[model samples]
Target: FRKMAFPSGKVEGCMVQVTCGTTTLNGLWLDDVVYCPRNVICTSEDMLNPNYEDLLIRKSNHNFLVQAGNVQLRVIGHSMQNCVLKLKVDTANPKTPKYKFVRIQPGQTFSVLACYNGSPSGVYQCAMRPNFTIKGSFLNGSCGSVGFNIDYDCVSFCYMHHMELPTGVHAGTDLEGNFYGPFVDRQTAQAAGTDTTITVNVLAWLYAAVINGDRWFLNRFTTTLNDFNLVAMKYNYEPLTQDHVDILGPLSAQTGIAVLDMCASLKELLQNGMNGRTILGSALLEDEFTPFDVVRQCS
Candidate 1:
C-alpha cells in the first residue's frame, strides 16, 4: 500500500482518492490510528456521470427544493457548456427517463422545474452529466462535481404523506378523520390529466378505511362494487361492462381531490391545535359527495 497527500501535505477538510489502471473506488480511508473519518461522503465523482451537479454552479446546504406542484432547480453553469437534466418521477414509480438537453451557459442563472401534476408521491433522483478536467485531475464519467444525483423529499408535498397526531391518537384516526383515499384519487387524477385506475382507487380507500377502524368504509366500497354491476345475470357476479368501467374511472379521480383537501385542512387544524385552541368541526361527507367548505377557517 502507498500513501497519497495533497498541496505539499495536510489532512484536514481535504479528501484523497487513490487511482490506478482504470478501476477506482471512492470512500477509502486515510491515517492509521487503526482506521477512520467522519461526515462528508467521498470523492465519488472519481468518474461519476451525475446529471444534476454538472450545471449547478452553487447552492445552499440542501441542494434541491421541496415545493408545490413544481420546484426550481438552480442550474448555474460553471463551464462554457451546458449540462443535461434527467429525472424519475419517483423510484417506486419510475417513468421512462426523459431528457431536457437544454444547456445552461456559464454564469447563467437557470431554474429547473421538477414537480409534475397527477404523479404519485415518492423520492426522486436528479442527475447532471458532463465529463471534464478540474485543476489537471481527470473527472471521468461524471457531472464532475458533488451535487449530481440528488434526492428530493416530495412526500412533504403529499398532504397525507405526513400527519401530526394528538396524544393517544392513532395515525389511522387522524388520516381517516381528514383524508379519504378514494377522494384523494380525484385530485391526483386532475393533475395527471387522465382517468383514475379503479383497482388502485378501490383498494386505497379500502385500506384507508380499515386503518381508521372504519368497517363502514369497507361496506361502502363493497356495496358499490357488488350493487353497481351492469351484467344481466342478477345473482352472478361478472365482469364490469364498458359503462360500469367508465363510471369507476371518474369516481376514483374525484376521490383523489377530496383526500388531498383533507390533508391540507387537517394540517391547518393541527397547526391551530398545536397553538392551544379547541376545535369544533364536523365532517359532512357522503359516498361520492364533495364537501363544500371554506378555503380559510376563522379561528
Candidate 2:
C-alpha cells in the first residue's frame, strides 16, 4: 500500500491513511522552516523642536516640558477587518516602557503623535499595522502583515503622576447613639425606646440652642420626663402619673434644682402615685396590683 502526502509536506500515499485507526502520526513528521527579510520602511521623521506646528505640549514647574509630535498615516489599501495601528515609545532603554494601540478602520487615515516627558529623552515610533494581533483580529485578518513606522522626539520638561484624595467631612457619633445630627422626634422615640434620650443628650450637649431654644416648656419637659421614664423602665417599674406630671411641669417652669434634689423630687412623686397599689405583685398576673393578703379579684 502507498502512503498519501499533504501539500505542506504530509505523506500523500500511505495504507494507514485509508485504514481504520491503523497508526498515529505522533513525532513521525517534519516540516520545512522559512525566514523572511526585515522590511524597513520609514513613514516620517521630525526633531524634538519646542515650537513645532500642530504639536501638543505640556509644561511642569520643574523646568521640564513634554510634547506630542504628531504624525498622520493613510491606509494604503483595503485591510483585513483586523487591521490596527500600534503606537510605541522606545525610550531606547527597556526599563522605561510606554506604548498605546489604536484600531485602523479600512481605508481611513489614523493619526497619533509621540507623548513623552520633558525631562526624559527617547525615540517615539508609530509602527504601521501591528506585527502581531494580541486578541486575534476579527477585522484585519492575520498578524505581522500590516503597516510602517513614524518617529519623533522630546524637548526639555518634567512629568510625574500624582495621586489625590477626595474632599469631604469626617462623620461623628451623636449621644443618642445615632450618627451626628438633629434629634429625631417622639414618634421616632417610641420606636427607639431608651435610645431616644441618648440621641437627645448628644444634640443638647453639642448645641445648647436645640435644648433651650423653645419657649414651650413641653419640649424640655417631655425630654426630661421621657428620660425619667427610661430610668423607671430600667428598674422594672412603670412610669406613674404623678412623676410624669411633676417632672413635665417643673421642666417646663425652668425651675433649676441641684441634680440630686431633682432626682429625689422625681422619686418621691413616683412613690406617691404608687400608694394605692402593692409593689410586690408580678406584673404578668391578673389582679397583679392589689393590697397584700386581699382576696384575689379574678377566679
Candidate 3:
C-alpha cells in the first residue's frame, strides 16, 4: 500500500518505488507532494538521472497536490516561443483562488491576460510540461509584459470535432456569436484572406446552445442511468450542466436572433410541463429517427 505524502519546499527524491513487483519509478518531486509505500527510502541517489520536475511535467491529466497558500500552476498552451500558463493563487483557501492566465516570453518576463481579475501575489513555481521551454518563478505577484493572439474563449473545444479546422476549408463561428469566414479553421480564416476578423466569432455559441439544451433535458428529466445512456450512447452526446446552459440561453437571446430566442422559449415550456414528452416535439415527423424521438421514447 502506498501512503499519500505531501512533502513541502522543492520536491526531492523518487515519487514512488515498489520492490519485488512489476513496477518502475518514473520521476520524483523535489518539493511537491506524492505517494510512497512503506519502508522505501526516497532519495536522489536511489534513482538514476533523476529529473527534478519530470513527474510534474510528464504526468498527464493528474494533479500534483500543493500545500495551502501555494501557487497551483497549469500549462494551458504554448505559442511559438511564449508559454501560456494558468495560475491559481491561494490553492488551499476555501474561497475560489484569484487566478490569472499569463503568457511568458523569453528571458523570464511575462504578461497577464486581460480576463484575470487581481494581480497574483505569491512565490509561484512550475515547469512547463514536455520540456521546460520557459520556467515560471514569481515573487510578490509581478512579472514583465507582451500580445493578443487567438482569444481562447472565442473558439470551441466542446464541439470542436464536429467542425472542420486546420485547412480553413469549412465555415465556422467563434465563441462570441460573431460569424467567421467562409473558411472554418483559424489558419484559413486568417490566411491570405482578409475580413475574417470582423466575422470569425459566432458558430460556437449556436452549437453550444443546441448541445447544452440536449444535455439539460437528458439530465433533469431522465430517470435512470439506462435512460441517460440511451441518449448518450445513441447520439454520442454527454450530459451537460444546467447552470451552464442557463448561461448560454441569455447570451443567445442577447445575440438577438429570433430562432435562438425560440430555442430558449421552447425548452422552458417543455421543462415546465409535466409531459416532457411533448417538448421533444413529434420526433419522427421526417420519418428519420431523431434524438428528440429517442428522448420521447425514453420519457
lDDT of 3 by residue, 77-154 (tens): 211111111122221223321222233211111111211112222222221111112222221112111111212232
TM-scores for every predicted model:
0.17, 0.13, 0.19
- Give the lowest summed-lDDT range of ten residues in model 3: 154-163
lDDT of each: 0.20, 0.20, 0.24
Question: Comparing 2 and 3 by lDDT, which wins?
Answer: 3
Which candidate tops TM-score? 3
- Say which candidate scores most in lDDT: 3
| Residue lDDT tens for model 2, 1-299 | 01111121011100010000221110000011100001101011312122222221221112111112221112122111111111112122112112222233111111111111111111121111111111112112111111211122211111111101111111111111122222111111211122111211111111221123421111222235556666656544444344334423323233343223343433443444434432223111111111110111111
Ranking by lDDT: 3, 1, 2
Superposed by TM-score, candidate 1 places the C-alpha of residue 26 at a distance from the truth, in angstroms, of 28
Model 1 lDDT tens row, 1-299: 00111111111111122122232211111121100011011123522332334323342323322111133222221121111111111111121121111222111111111111212111222111111101111122211111111113210111111111222111100111122111211111211122212222222233233333443321211223333433212312223344434433433354443332332332232223324322111132111111110101100
Displacement of the residue 263 alpha carbon in candidate 3, Å: 7.7
Q: Any idea how many clashes model 1 has?
A: 27
RMSD, each candidate, Å?
23.0, 34.7, 21.1
